[PDB]
Design a binder for this molecule. Structure first.
Ligand SMILES: [Ca+2]
Ligand SMILES: [Ca+2]
Ligand SMILES: [Ca+2]
Ligand SMILES: [Ca+2]
Ligand SMILES: [Ca+2]
Ligand SMILES: [Ca+2]
Ligand SMILES: [Ca+2]
Length: 318
Protein backbone atom coordinates (compact mmCIF):
# COMPACT_ATOMS: atom_id res chain seq x y z
CA UNK A 1 0.00 0.00 0.00
CA UNK A 2 1.08 3.57 -0.78
CA UNK A 3 2.08 6.12 1.90
CA UNK A 4 -0.82 8.23 3.16
CA UNK A 5 -1.61 11.52 1.50
CA UNK A 6 -4.31 14.04 2.26
CA UNK A 7 -6.60 14.78 -0.69
CA UNK A 8 -7.07 18.52 -1.30
CA UNK A 9 -10.75 18.31 -0.50
CA UNK A 10 -10.11 17.08 3.03
CA UNK A 11 -8.01 20.19 3.74
CA UNK A 12 -10.46 22.48 1.89
CA UNK A 13 -13.24 21.59 4.32
CA UNK A 14 -10.95 22.21 7.32
CA UNK A 15 -11.16 18.70 8.77
CA UNK A 16 -7.62 17.90 9.94
CA UNK A 17 -7.63 20.56 12.65
CA UNK A 18 -10.74 19.04 14.21
CA UNK A 19 -9.26 15.64 14.81
CA UNK A 20 -7.67 16.71 18.11
CA UNK A 21 -11.22 17.25 19.41
CA UNK A 22 -12.69 14.26 17.63
CA UNK A 23 -12.05 12.21 14.51
CA UNK A 24 -15.62 10.88 14.62
CA UNK A 25 -14.79 7.85 16.84
CA UNK A 26 -17.47 8.66 19.39
CA UNK A 27 -19.23 5.28 19.63
CA UNK A 28 -22.84 6.42 19.32
CA UNK A 29 -22.16 7.93 15.85
CA UNK A 30 -22.55 6.02 12.58
CA UNK A 31 -22.79 7.29 9.04
CA UNK A 32 -24.93 5.23 6.60
CA UNK A 33 -23.82 5.46 2.98
CA UNK A 34 -26.45 4.32 0.50
CA UNK A 35 -24.53 3.51 -2.62
CA UNK A 36 -23.00 0.68 -4.72
CA UNK A 37 -21.60 -1.18 -1.65
CA UNK A 38 -18.11 -1.18 -0.16
CA UNK A 39 -14.79 -2.99 -0.56
CA UNK A 40 -15.27 -4.09 3.05
CA UNK A 41 -11.73 -5.40 3.60
CA UNK A 42 -9.89 -2.51 2.06
CA UNK A 43 -6.98 -1.86 4.42
CA UNK A 44 -7.76 1.82 4.51
CA UNK A 45 -11.43 1.24 5.35
CA UNK A 46 -12.05 -2.04 7.06
CA UNK A 47 -11.77 -1.12 10.70
CA UNK A 48 -14.41 1.56 10.20
CA UNK A 49 -17.00 -0.64 8.45
CA UNK A 50 -19.48 -1.59 11.10
CA UNK A 51 -22.20 -2.91 8.80
CA UNK A 52 -22.11 -4.11 5.21
CA UNK A 53 -25.69 -4.69 4.03
CA UNK A 54 -27.56 -4.86 0.72
CA UNK A 55 -31.19 -4.12 -0.06
CA UNK A 56 -31.05 -5.07 -3.75
CA UNK A 57 -34.18 -6.70 -5.18
CA UNK A 58 -36.07 -6.10 -2.00
CA UNK A 59 -33.95 -8.52 0.03
CA UNK A 60 -31.98 -7.38 3.03
CA UNK A 61 -28.66 -9.32 3.05
CA UNK A 62 -25.34 -9.10 4.86
CA UNK A 63 -23.75 -11.81 2.81
CA UNK A 64 -20.37 -10.34 1.92
CA UNK A 65 -20.66 -11.03 -1.79
CA UNK A 66 -24.07 -9.33 -1.77
CA UNK A 67 -22.87 -6.24 0.09
CA UNK A 68 -19.48 -5.82 -1.61
CA UNK A 69 -18.98 -3.01 -4.08
CA UNK A 70 -19.15 -4.28 -7.66
CA UNK A 71 -18.78 -0.74 -9.15
CA UNK A 72 -16.29 1.36 -7.15
CA UNK A 73 -18.51 4.39 -6.48
CA UNK A 74 -19.49 3.48 -2.92
CA UNK A 75 -15.97 2.58 -1.88
CA UNK A 76 -14.80 6.00 -3.17
CA UNK A 77 -17.61 7.89 -1.37
CA UNK A 78 -16.99 5.99 1.87
CA UNK A 79 -13.28 6.76 1.74
CA UNK A 80 -13.99 10.46 1.51
CA UNK A 81 -15.94 10.23 4.75
CA UNK A 82 -13.95 7.71 6.67
CA UNK A 83 -10.65 6.45 5.19
CA UNK A 84 -8.40 5.70 8.20
CA UNK A 85 -5.77 8.17 9.40
CA UNK A 86 -2.77 5.88 9.39
CA UNK A 87 0.34 5.25 7.29
CA UNK A 88 -1.36 4.34 3.99
CA UNK A 89 -3.67 5.56 1.29
CA UNK A 90 -5.85 8.56 1.92
CA UNK A 91 -7.74 9.89 4.92
CA UNK A 92 -11.36 10.82 5.38
CA UNK A 93 -13.05 13.87 6.80
CA UNK A 94 -14.03 11.85 9.87
CA UNK A 95 -11.37 9.14 9.82
CA UNK A 96 -12.54 7.49 13.02
CA UNK A 97 -16.26 7.33 12.22
CA UNK A 98 -18.19 4.09 12.04
CA UNK A 99 -19.72 3.40 8.63
CA UNK A 100 -22.78 1.45 7.53
CA UNK A 101 -22.47 0.57 3.86
CA UNK A 102 -26.03 0.09 2.56
CA UNK A 103 -25.93 -1.24 -0.97
CA UNK A 104 -28.91 0.15 -2.82
CA UNK A 105 -27.29 0.40 -6.30
CA UNK A 106 -26.12 -2.41 -8.53
CA UNK A 107 -22.82 -3.09 -10.30
CA UNK A 108 -23.76 -0.43 -12.81
CA UNK A 109 -24.62 2.24 -10.26
CA UNK A 110 -28.31 1.84 -10.88
CA UNK A 111 -31.03 1.28 -8.38
CA UNK A 112 -34.73 0.93 -7.91
CA UNK A 113 -36.58 3.39 -5.77
CA UNK A 114 -38.05 0.66 -3.58
CA UNK A 115 -34.53 -0.69 -2.88
CA UNK A 116 -33.35 2.82 -1.93
CA UNK A 117 -36.39 3.33 0.27
CA UNK A 118 -35.64 0.05 2.05
CA UNK A 119 -32.04 1.17 2.44
CA UNK A 120 -33.24 4.30 4.20
CA UNK A 121 -35.34 2.17 6.55
CA UNK A 122 -32.30 -0.03 7.26
CA UNK A 123 -30.24 3.04 8.25
CA UNK A 124 -32.92 3.75 10.88
CA UNK A 125 -33.35 0.16 12.03
CA UNK A 126 -29.63 -0.58 12.04
CA UNK A 127 -27.88 -3.92 12.39
CA UNK A 128 -30.14 -5.14 15.20
CA UNK A 129 -33.38 -4.66 13.20
CA UNK A 130 -35.22 -2.65 15.88
CA UNK A 131 -35.72 1.14 15.79
CA UNK A 132 -35.90 1.97 19.51
CA UNK A 133 -34.66 -1.06 21.39
CA UNK A 134 -34.74 0.44 24.88
CA UNK A 135 -38.12 2.20 24.33
CA UNK A 136 -36.80 5.60 25.52
CA UNK A 137 -38.09 7.43 22.48
CA UNK A 138 -34.60 8.36 21.25
CA UNK A 139 -33.17 6.74 18.07
CA UNK A 140 -30.42 8.91 16.58
CA UNK A 141 -27.94 9.90 19.31
CA UNK A 142 -28.84 7.01 21.65
CA UNK A 143 -25.91 4.75 22.52
CA UNK A 144 -28.45 2.02 23.44
CA UNK A 145 -29.55 1.84 19.82
CA UNK A 146 -27.59 1.38 16.62
CA UNK A 147 -29.44 3.80 14.30
CA UNK A 148 -27.27 5.89 12.08
CA UNK A 149 -26.97 9.63 12.67
CA UNK A 150 -26.23 10.60 9.06
CA UNK A 151 -27.62 9.16 5.82
CA UNK A 152 -25.39 10.02 2.81
CA UNK A 153 -26.89 9.62 -0.64
CA UNK A 154 -24.54 10.16 -3.59
CA UNK A 155 -27.31 9.29 -6.02
CA UNK A 156 -30.10 11.16 -7.62
CA UNK A 157 -32.43 11.73 -10.43
CA UNK A 158 -35.44 13.65 -11.58
CA UNK A 159 -37.95 11.16 -10.15
CA UNK A 160 -39.72 11.99 -6.92
CA UNK A 161 -41.04 8.67 -5.36
CA UNK A 162 -43.38 9.16 -2.38
CA UNK A 163 -42.48 5.78 -0.80
CA UNK A 164 -38.79 6.73 -0.80
CA UNK A 165 -39.72 10.21 0.43
CA UNK A 166 -41.82 8.85 3.27
CA UNK A 167 -38.70 6.95 4.44
CA UNK A 168 -36.64 10.11 4.30
CA UNK A 169 -39.31 11.81 6.43
CA UNK A 170 -39.18 8.95 8.89
CA UNK A 171 -35.39 9.29 9.19
CA UNK A 172 -35.49 13.06 9.55
CA UNK A 173 -38.06 12.76 12.30
CA UNK A 174 -35.85 10.18 14.04
CA UNK A 175 -33.15 12.87 14.24
CA UNK A 176 -31.03 11.61 11.35
CA UNK A 177 -29.28 14.15 9.13
CA UNK A 178 -29.73 13.37 5.43
CA UNK A 179 -27.25 14.56 2.87
CA UNK A 180 -27.46 14.08 -0.94
CA UNK A 181 -25.81 15.06 -4.24
CA UNK A 182 -27.38 17.99 -6.07
CA UNK A 183 -26.73 16.21 -9.40
CA UNK A 184 -24.49 16.68 -12.41
CA UNK A 185 -26.64 18.08 -15.29
CA UNK A 186 -25.98 21.78 -14.71
CA UNK A 187 -29.70 21.97 -14.04
CA UNK A 188 -31.39 24.91 -12.39
CA UNK A 189 -32.40 22.97 -9.25
CA UNK A 190 -31.29 19.77 -7.46
CA UNK A 191 -32.15 16.19 -8.25
CA UNK A 192 -34.10 14.06 -5.74
CA UNK A 193 -33.55 13.20 -3.00
CA UNK A 194 -31.37 16.31 -2.57
CA UNK A 195 -34.34 18.50 -3.47
CA UNK A 196 -36.42 17.36 -0.50
CA UNK A 197 -36.56 19.98 2.26
CA UNK A 198 -35.51 17.38 4.81
CA UNK A 199 -32.29 16.73 2.88
CA UNK A 200 -29.09 18.78 2.48
CA UNK A 201 -28.39 19.23 -1.26
CA UNK A 202 -24.68 19.40 -2.00
CA UNK A 203 -23.03 21.11 -4.98
CA UNK A 204 -19.46 20.65 -6.14
CA UNK A 205 -16.54 23.04 -6.29
CA UNK A 206 -13.13 22.59 -7.89
CA UNK A 207 -9.68 23.24 -6.41
CA UNK A 208 -9.85 26.89 -7.54
CA UNK A 209 -13.08 27.42 -5.53
CA UNK A 210 -15.12 27.70 -8.66
CA UNK A 211 -18.39 25.82 -8.80
CA UNK A 212 -18.27 22.97 -11.32
CA UNK A 213 -20.25 23.67 -14.45
CA UNK A 214 -22.03 20.31 -14.09
CA UNK A 215 -23.15 21.04 -10.53
CA UNK A 216 -26.95 21.26 -10.30
CA UNK A 217 -27.86 24.70 -8.98
CA UNK A 218 -29.67 25.84 -5.87
CA UNK A 219 -27.81 23.47 -3.52
CA UNK A 220 -27.82 24.04 0.21
CA UNK A 221 -24.02 23.86 0.61
CA UNK A 222 -21.08 23.01 -1.61
CA UNK A 223 -17.94 20.99 -1.20
CA UNK A 224 -14.96 19.53 -3.13
CA UNK A 225 -16.15 17.57 -6.13
CA UNK A 226 -13.55 17.70 -8.89
CA UNK A 227 -10.29 15.69 -8.93
CA UNK A 228 -11.17 13.74 -5.75
CA UNK A 229 -8.81 10.94 -4.88
CA UNK A 230 -10.20 8.29 -2.58
CA UNK A 231 -10.32 4.57 -1.91
CA UNK A 232 -11.43 2.19 -4.74
CA UNK A 233 -11.70 -1.60 -5.14
CA UNK A 234 -9.75 -3.77 -4.93
CA UNK A 235 -7.71 -2.36 -2.06
CA UNK A 236 -6.88 0.45 -4.48
CA UNK A 237 -7.35 4.25 -5.03
CA UNK A 238 -8.99 6.24 -7.80
CA UNK A 239 -9.89 9.80 -8.79
CA UNK A 240 -13.47 10.71 -9.55
CA UNK A 241 -15.57 13.86 -9.97
CA UNK A 242 -19.19 14.66 -9.30
CA UNK A 243 -21.59 16.01 -6.73
CA UNK A 244 -21.41 12.38 -5.52
CA UNK A 245 -17.81 13.24 -4.29
CA UNK A 246 -18.88 16.54 -2.70
CA UNK A 247 -21.66 14.83 -0.73
CA UNK A 248 -19.38 12.70 1.55
CA UNK A 249 -17.33 15.71 2.52
CA UNK A 250 -20.52 17.24 3.96
CA UNK A 251 -21.58 13.96 5.58
CA UNK A 252 -18.17 13.80 7.23
CA UNK A 253 -18.53 17.36 8.55
CA UNK A 254 -21.92 16.42 9.98
CA UNK A 255 -20.41 13.36 11.64
CA UNK A 256 -17.75 15.57 13.29
CA UNK A 257 -20.34 18.08 14.52
CA UNK A 258 -22.50 15.39 16.06
CA UNK A 259 -19.56 13.43 17.52
CA UNK A 260 -18.12 16.56 19.12
CA UNK A 261 -21.49 17.79 20.42
CA UNK A 262 -22.24 14.41 21.94
CA UNK A 263 -18.73 14.14 23.39
CA UNK A 264 -19.42 17.37 25.24
CA UNK A 265 -23.13 17.27 26.06
CA UNK A 266 -24.23 13.62 25.87
CA UNK A 267 -26.85 14.44 23.23
CA UNK A 268 -26.83 15.32 19.54
CA UNK A 269 -28.08 18.44 17.80
CA UNK A 270 -31.45 18.50 16.00
CA UNK A 271 -31.21 18.30 12.20
CA UNK A 272 -32.70 21.69 11.41
CA UNK A 273 -34.06 23.23 8.24
CA UNK A 274 -32.86 24.92 5.06
CA UNK A 275 -33.67 28.37 6.39
CA UNK A 276 -31.97 27.97 9.76
CA UNK A 277 -29.12 30.41 10.42
CA UNK A 278 -28.80 29.78 14.11
CA UNK A 279 -26.20 27.64 15.86
CA UNK A 280 -28.93 25.48 17.43
CA UNK A 281 -29.20 22.79 14.72
CA UNK A 282 -26.76 20.94 12.44
CA UNK A 283 -28.05 22.65 9.37
CA UNK A 284 -27.93 26.07 11.00
CA UNK A 285 -24.28 25.49 11.95
CA UNK A 286 -23.40 24.29 8.45
CA UNK A 287 -24.97 27.37 6.91
CA UNK A 288 -23.44 30.04 9.14
CA UNK A 289 -19.93 28.55 9.25
CA UNK A 290 -19.65 27.83 5.50
CA UNK A 291 -17.17 29.86 3.47
CA UNK A 292 -19.57 32.19 1.72
CA UNK A 293 -18.42 32.35 -1.94
CA UNK A 294 -20.32 34.00 -4.77
CA UNK A 295 -22.89 36.67 -4.03
CA UNK A 296 -23.11 37.34 -0.30
CA UNK A 297 -25.44 34.92 1.41
CA UNK A 298 -27.16 31.89 -0.01
CA UNK A 299 -26.80 31.80 -3.80
CA UNK A 300 -27.77 29.37 -6.53
CA UNK A 301 -24.18 28.29 -7.32
CA UNK A 302 -22.65 27.68 -3.89
CA UNK A 303 -25.72 27.47 -1.64
CA UNK A 304 -24.77 28.89 1.74
CA UNK A 305 -21.14 28.16 0.96
CA UNK A 306 -18.31 25.66 1.25
CA UNK A 307 -18.56 23.59 4.43
CA UNK A 308 -15.89 24.08 7.09
CA UNK A 309 -15.49 21.47 9.78
CA UNK A 310 -13.23 23.34 12.25
CA UNK A 311 -15.53 26.35 12.36
CA UNK A 312 -18.66 24.21 12.47
CA UNK A 313 -17.37 22.25 15.45
CA UNK A 314 -16.32 25.42 17.26
CA UNK A 315 -19.85 26.78 16.70
CA UNK A 316 -21.46 23.60 17.95
CA UNK A 317 -19.42 23.62 21.18
CA UNK A 318 -19.61 27.32 21.91
CA1 LIG B 1 -26.01 5.74 16.43
CA1 LIG C 1 -5.15 6.18 5.39
CA1 LIG D 1 -31.58 -0.58 15.83
CA1 LIG E 1 -33.65 4.40 22.26
CA1 LIG F 1 -31.18 5.14 25.70
CA1 LIG G 1 -10.60 -5.76 -1.01
CA1 LIG H 1 -22.77 33.15 -1.35
Amino acid sequence: QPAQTIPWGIERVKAPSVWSITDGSVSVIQVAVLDTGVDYDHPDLAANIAWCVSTLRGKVSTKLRDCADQNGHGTHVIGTIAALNNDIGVVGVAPGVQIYSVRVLDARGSGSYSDIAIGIEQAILGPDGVADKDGDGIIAGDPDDDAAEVISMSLGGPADDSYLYDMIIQAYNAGIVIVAASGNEGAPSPSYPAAYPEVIAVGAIDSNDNIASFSNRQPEVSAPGVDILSTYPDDSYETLMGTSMATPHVSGVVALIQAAYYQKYGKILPVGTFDDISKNTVRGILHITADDLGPTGWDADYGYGVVRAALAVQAALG
